[PDB]
Symmetry: C3
Subunit: 403 residues, 3 copies
Amino acid sequence: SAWNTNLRWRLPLTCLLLQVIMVILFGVFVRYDFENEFYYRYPSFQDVHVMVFVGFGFLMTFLQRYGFSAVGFNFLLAAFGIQWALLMQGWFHFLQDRYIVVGVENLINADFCVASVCVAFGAVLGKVSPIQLLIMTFFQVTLFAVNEFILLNLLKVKDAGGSMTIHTFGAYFGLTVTRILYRRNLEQSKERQNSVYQSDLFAMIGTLFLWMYWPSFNSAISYHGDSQHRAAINTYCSLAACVLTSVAISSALHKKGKLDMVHIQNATLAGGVAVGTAAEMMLMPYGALIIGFVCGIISTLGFVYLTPFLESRLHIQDTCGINNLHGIPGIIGGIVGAVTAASDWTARTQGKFQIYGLLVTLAMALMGGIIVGLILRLPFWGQPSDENCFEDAVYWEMPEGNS
Amino acid sequence: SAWNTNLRWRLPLTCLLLQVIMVILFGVFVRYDFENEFYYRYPSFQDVHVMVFVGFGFLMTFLQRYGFSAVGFNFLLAAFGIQWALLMQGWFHFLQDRYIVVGVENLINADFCVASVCVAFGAVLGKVSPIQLLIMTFFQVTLFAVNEFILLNLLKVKDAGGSMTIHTFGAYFGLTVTRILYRRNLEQSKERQNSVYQSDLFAMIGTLFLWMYWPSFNSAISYHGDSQHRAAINTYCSLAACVLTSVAISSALHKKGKLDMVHIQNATLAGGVAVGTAAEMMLMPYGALIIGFVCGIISTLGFVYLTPFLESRLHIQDTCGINNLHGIPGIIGGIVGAVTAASDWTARTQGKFQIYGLLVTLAMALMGGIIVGLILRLPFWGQPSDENCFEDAVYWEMPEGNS
Amino acid sequence: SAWNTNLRWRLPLTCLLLQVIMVILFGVFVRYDFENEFYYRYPSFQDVHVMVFVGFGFLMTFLQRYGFSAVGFNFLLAAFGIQWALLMQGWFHFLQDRYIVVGVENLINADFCVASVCVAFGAVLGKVSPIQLLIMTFFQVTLFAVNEFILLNLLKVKDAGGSMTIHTFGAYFGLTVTRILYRRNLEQSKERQNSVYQSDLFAMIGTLFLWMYWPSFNSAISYHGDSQHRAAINTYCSLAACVLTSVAISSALHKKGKLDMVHIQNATLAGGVAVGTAAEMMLMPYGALIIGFVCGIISTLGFVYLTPFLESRLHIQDTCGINNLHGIPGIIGGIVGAVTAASDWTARTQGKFQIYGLLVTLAMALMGGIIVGLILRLPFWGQPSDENCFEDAVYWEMPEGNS
Ligand SMILES: CCCCCCCCO[C@@H]1O[C@H](CO)[C@@H](O)[C@H](O)[C@H]1O
Ligand SMILES: CCCCCCCCO[C@@H]1O[C@H](CO)[C@@H](O)[C@H](O)[C@H]1O
Ligand SMILES: CCCCCCCCO[C@@H]1O[C@H](CO)[C@@H](O)[C@H](O)[C@H]1O
């Protein structure tokens, strides 16, 4: 029944089937080799790992009665996704036409891949079952891997910090999915689509770990040590500038000049997304400050004006405002990456192909999102009703100390 | 008086005596030497350090009115324990028959030793005074050091991630202690032996830092870089698989298919414990996925069925269900370590001695737990009454903003 | 109007002006170079980065209705401060009489500089607007840079962990500022100048990340690997001993022997501050244990007896008791640094100049604090009234789920 949110058969079936398949496929394909890349790369892996599980995980706990599902479903989707990503990204790097040799570099890329699903989760947060999220993860990891392969291998595009492959891709995939999953009577749940004091403090845990570790995120897969150092510092600068302009615009747009925690939790991160592609390329930090400057402003304007417009007029219900953080700043990051790439004819042509990568990313996000959206819209997955969204009690036993 | 929980003389006396003794013993024995092991090992130290103080610390804050004592007593017991561990573990490595030369490697092992006490704390949490915890730490660190010496030095057993030396040892020591400390009327406090919404979110801080950093935990003291890399990735895999099966079984065992935060906070960590010994030995990741697969299932079944049975029929009151996370998966880890070790005659004999190490660990945990249990049962230490357990107000001034 | 806390023009103006100036000055002066210092130093940078944004940020969230402003204003002041510090500290290291070449070492020092402002923020927390904090940061970063230059370059003083340059300087600057900003009717807000249960748990996030990462804080800029290793372990020891004596004295001073979370959150950190200067110099760990031993006691006595006395008799309103953590232990750290430095004539003279550095730091903190205090006291900045302190609602839109 379409009203049945009882997942006692379906969720275990989905989890166990997926995990058995992971076991079989690891047995067939995945192997180990027999100073280290471990020592020089593991620290970057850990920072990205924290951003996925604690950064995105707690960021989404701002919802007053959706904290368990935010951190807990993120935990679940990412635990599955990292395994499936190792395989999908792996298959584009077979050794002996049949082995995926895994090292720390594979783990780093698997977490980046999953980060795109954490982005998409932000659009549909509160309105989808954990079964829908696992199905989304299954298809989105595949699509991410194919898009990444087209960009990095076929088009020879550079995108170290994933403004295109992670943020633009994840955002517009997520937003396409959420549009297909449009809920006409979502206002029936709107009393829970907000924060309470304590949930905004938990969410700042997420914000701060993303913001602090983003310089590793953007530098982890830069190749030369020289560009890695530059990627990190440019990201650090862009993020710093983003905080001041996000705060400035949050205040400016409020009638009493008061700040809004949605802006401080989310718009302050836009400078990280926007230098994903360019951070490793920019020879001077002042440009990174400008990117952070502009994107804090644009992100905050997006939350205030664009989100309500897109929901009202275009039927895009975007719980975490991922369009304002990952989407628009992702596209900006892609464009700035192209311009920075172009700065002889070989430079000019690199610039054009960076743009090709952006357009390919968007096409894949749209087409992929339509397909996955339509699958997720089927009434089989235990999704809640329009008046039961943003409510943990639908999928969790609620604490005994409360009830 | 046995009803007197006023620690104004006894707690300061205990803290100051212990710390003065640490000062004297450091003065006599502890010295420094006069790329670096600092650079290559300090990062692993920090990850383990976080798991001890923030991981276990916040994990135990799920108790609705025991958050201060959970994080705060963990802080206190570990601050003492790391110092005493440096000495106890140190004495088994005298230089010049009388000096303990400390480097980062000593700090790593001291934190591992204390992790075993954090495990044991999980069984007695809410029912013991901070004085009892310091006394427990004093004796348990000593017992840990002797057990570790027997296993690693005398039996030449391998246990990089401590499935035996930390988890099995800590769990069955803790459970033996809690059995001796059995409280006939504990149901009088049962209204506080649970979570509220916000305490389950704080506890997820603990869960996630343990889960994310466990790959360092299991690889920190692996010797070759080759096995270290393998230890980390096998742990990462086992933990991933553990989340999916823990979630599957939590749902399956609920009448409405709903998830339980006790399972998501604790059973999701069982795959880390279970590959402690084998992670560095397993040449293929698919085996690690299987270990995580099985242990998520077993851990969750333990929480639902074994914990109530052991409390009902065997009088084992296990606050954090450490038997389900550290105990059974610890023994499994020890057994899988033996089988993996055995996979010529030298391999076969290594296998048998791994099993000897498991049996020795259990014997030490039982005998040590009986002795320490009986000391802790003495009415001198300011332990609370059966109707005043899981209540911070017994040992803390409660916030002025509330009262 | 002096009663006008509406920052809709003033806060955006302040943020945008400051950030545009940062952009211009980075464009003129700041450049990049064209194994790595990145690899060996970035990890230490990250630990310090976490201490600034999450450590100090969450530490100050103990205030029951000031959690947003504590973590959020810290975020804002530090985001500005790191940029301005890169410039101010940079100008004392021009290349080509006009370029600041930034690497990871610059980022580490910029975060240390900002840490001093996080300290000062602790005195004025709850009673100053975000505009006052940005103005304070602007001047305090400049003063920090000049004081650091006098000490390190002109006086050839050693202070790796900043007992003088960060803690003593920050504390007495902050306390001078707060004295000039004395509020006669602050008791009108005293119902919010306290914690609730959940705010004390958030604050422990801050406490624990400071405590765990402090060994990196104190070793990050030690030059030789030998002294770095020593700085870290001495800090680890001092902090451990500090917890036991802080707990002992918290209990001893309570009529019922109960612990106070103010002491466990703050006094437990005093051993880190007190070995800032000496940690890299002390050849034996037992001395570090003694410093932590004494400073836990002194810090806790300060919270109980000195804070109320200084507020009552000397009109020093110190929200976070920074005198007890950063001030007195900072001066102790400076004194122990001198004695440790002195332990031939060249050693003796180093000792005297360490003391000169302490006296210069205090003079700069006082003079600088008077000037900045008087500027901040002007009624232009949107500071709240005496009955509206420690209240987020003054500067933030409050969560919709509550209102
Ligand atoms: C969001 C759009 C803002 C405009 C982009 C910021 C300016 C680009 O930054 C550029 O960095 C280069 C480093 O390679 C410098 O050579 C250029 O002078 C600088 O303009
Ligand atoms: C919890 C018990 C589950 C059974 C143990 C998991 C299977 C052991 O994993 C083993 O790893 C080895 C790597 O050295 C491989 O060679 C073996 O093929 C594989 O079975
Ligand atoms: C807070 C004041 C407490 C007194 C200071 C602690 C003692 C100083 O510690 C000193 O460390 C030296 C290492 O260089 C040792 O040589 C000395 O024996 C030891 O006393």
